[PDB]
Amino acid sequence: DVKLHGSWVSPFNYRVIWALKLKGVEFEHIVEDLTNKSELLLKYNPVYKKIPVLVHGGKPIAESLVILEYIEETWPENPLLPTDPYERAMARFWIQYGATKTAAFGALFRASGEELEKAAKEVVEVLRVLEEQGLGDKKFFGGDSINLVDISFGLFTCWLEAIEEAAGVKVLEPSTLPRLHAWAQNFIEVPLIKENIPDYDKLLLHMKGVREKMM
Amino acid sequence: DVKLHGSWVSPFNYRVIWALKLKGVEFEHIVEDLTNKSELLLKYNPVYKKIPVLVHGGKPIAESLVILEYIEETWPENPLLPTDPYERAMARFWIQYGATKTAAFGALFRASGEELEKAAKEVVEVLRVLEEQGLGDKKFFGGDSINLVDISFGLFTCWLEAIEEAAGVKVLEPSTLPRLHAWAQNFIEVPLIKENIPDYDKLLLHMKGVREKMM
Numbered sequence: 001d002v003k004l005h006g007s008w009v010s011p012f013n014y015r016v017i018w019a020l021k022l023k024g025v026e027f028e029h030i031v032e033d034l035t036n037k038s039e040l041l042l043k044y045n046p047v048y049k050k051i052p053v054l055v056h057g058g059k060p061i062a063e064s065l066v067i068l069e070y071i072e073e074t075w076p077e078n079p080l081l082p083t084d085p086y087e088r089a090m091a092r093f094w095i096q097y098g099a100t101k102t103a104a105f106g107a108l109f110r111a112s113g114e115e116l117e118k119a120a121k122e123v124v125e126v127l128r129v130l131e132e133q134g135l136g137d138k139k140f141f142g143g144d145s146i147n148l149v150d151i152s153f154g155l156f157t158c159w160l161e162a163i164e165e166a167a168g169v170k171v172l173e174p175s176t177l178p179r180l181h182a183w184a185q186n187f188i189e190v191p192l193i194k195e196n197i198p199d200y201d202k203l204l205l206h207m208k209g210v211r212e213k214m215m
Numbered sequence: 216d217v218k219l220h221g222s223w224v225s226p227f228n229y230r231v232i233w234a235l236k237l238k239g240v241e242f243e244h245i246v247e248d249l250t251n252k253s254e255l256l257l258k259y260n261p262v263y264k265k266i267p268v269l270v271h272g273g274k275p276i277a278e279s280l281v282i283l284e285y286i287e288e289t290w291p292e293n294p295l296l297p298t299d300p301y302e303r304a305m306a307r308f309w310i311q312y313g314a315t316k317t318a319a320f321g322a323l324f325r326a327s328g329e330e331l332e333k334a335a336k337e338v339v340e341v342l343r344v345l346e347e348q349g350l351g352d353k354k355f356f357g358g359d360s361i362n363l364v365d366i367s368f369g370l371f372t373c374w375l376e377a378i379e380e381a382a383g384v385k386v387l388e389p390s391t392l393p394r395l396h397a398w399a400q401n402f403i404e405v406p407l408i409k410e411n412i413p414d415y416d417k418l419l420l421h422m423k424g425v426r427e428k429m430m
């Protein structure tokens with residue numbers, strides 16, 4: 001009834017895995033080979049031809065942020081967004097902030113030496129705004145438990161750690177981002193997240209390969 | 216009770232004007248001078264320092280797409296989104312498609328001659344996907360009346376017309392995009408839209424100035 005056209009490494013696909021597991025939704029995970037995309041993937045997502053694609057009752061939903069809101073509306077129990085409209089707008093605002101800034105992380109796999117340091121410092125500043133104005137003193141972006149905002153920022157945990165190791169630069173450190181670093185540790189320790197993340201060695205190998213083609 | 220920090224030309228600000236007027240919400244329009252931003256604008260939107268910013272009960276909401284969903288949730292009567300989750304996901308998908316592609320329209324004010332023709336043809340292709348897969352045979356993206364998707368694409372009416380005149384290229388034409396061109400005419404003729412759009416001569420003068428600094 002629910003199928004997820006995914007990947008073993010995509011952070012965008014893992015957002016969907018987390019939301020489905022938080023709702024207790026049974027699903028079939030179909031891992032796509034991106035060098036030879038299936039006929040179902042091209043039919044279900046003709047506009048972008050990308051994963052993830054959620055298929056529910058044979059009907060496709062593409063784009064991880066659109067999928068997450070669909071899951072929240074379709075399975076409303078175990079809510080992943082607040083009820084108050086102003087609080088929901090703040091959650092959507094921070095999710096969109098992450099979506100707009102995820103591009104500035106590309107410079108980490110494009111720049112070198114005394115240019116890569118500047119790219120890392122710019123990314124620390126992006127994360128500091130999120131820490132100060134978004135997270136604040138809460139344990140999670142969702143308060144006492146994870147919500148769609150935590151899920152949307154999960155890529156700043158093991159995926160960012162792998163990018164840091166592949167590029168040879170430091171970004172999310174406790175000295176510079178104390179609350180965000182504590183959040184990243186708490187997020188990765190949530191049993192649902194810990195049991196549903198790529199193997200770090202495999203993820204690091206994937207990130208090293210991505211950095212190689214981006215130079 | 217409701218204030219809108221706006222502009223006389225921003226299409227993003229006009230999205231918010233339309234949604235407020237469709238809900239019958241009374242508001243004060245505060246036109247900001249972007250060369251000397253008010254202390255209230257910098258306090259209400261510290262992350263982007265941009266308009267529009269909706270202020271409701273003294274609490275600010277920035278980013279036109281976030282504001283639109285806040286208005287829809289706060290004033291649920293006269294709905295601007297469908298009730299079915301799959302239909303709501305399709306609406307959010309097309310809104311995000313427009314938000315991702317609005318950047319490719321910048322090339323219209325950057326390129327010249329036999330390069331500007333290629334940029335215009337690329338934009339026609341972006342609009343054709345929206346026409347075929349999004350609009351289809353419906354009068355509006357919202358069916359028989361305008362919804363958040365029509366509002367999000369309203370910039371493809373008089374703002375795109377002004378960009379076409381300023382740049383000297385044609386994009387949205389009836390021969391090439393029959394259904395989307397009929398939609399743009401029907402949208403601009405909706406009394407709520409017709410009574411709430413910038414004066415074309417002033418908008419064209421603004422677009423010519425924007426093209427001059429972008430070259």
Ligand SMILES: O=C1C[C@@H](c2ccccc2)Oc2cc(O)cc(O)c21
Pocket residue numbers: 009010011102105106155156159160163
């Ligand atoms: O576009 C991105 C974003 C990037 C990232 C991860 C963590 C922090 C910042 C940026 O990770 C990726 C990995 C992929 O397998 C495919 C992607 O398309 C991306």
Ligand SMILES: O=C1C[C@@H](c2ccccc2)Oc2cc(O)cc(O)c21
Pocket residue numbers: 224225226317320321370371374375378
């Ligand atoms: O970013 C944009 C988008 C652009 C547009 C309009 C119509 C069709 C495509 C693109 O119009 C604008 C006008 C502004 O006063 C300020 C802006 O920041 C924009």
Ligand SMILES: [Cl-]
Pocket residue numbers: 012051052063064065
């Ligand atoms: Cl995605």
Ligand SMILES: [Cl-]
Pocket residue numbers: 227266267278279280
């Ligand atoms: Cl905006």
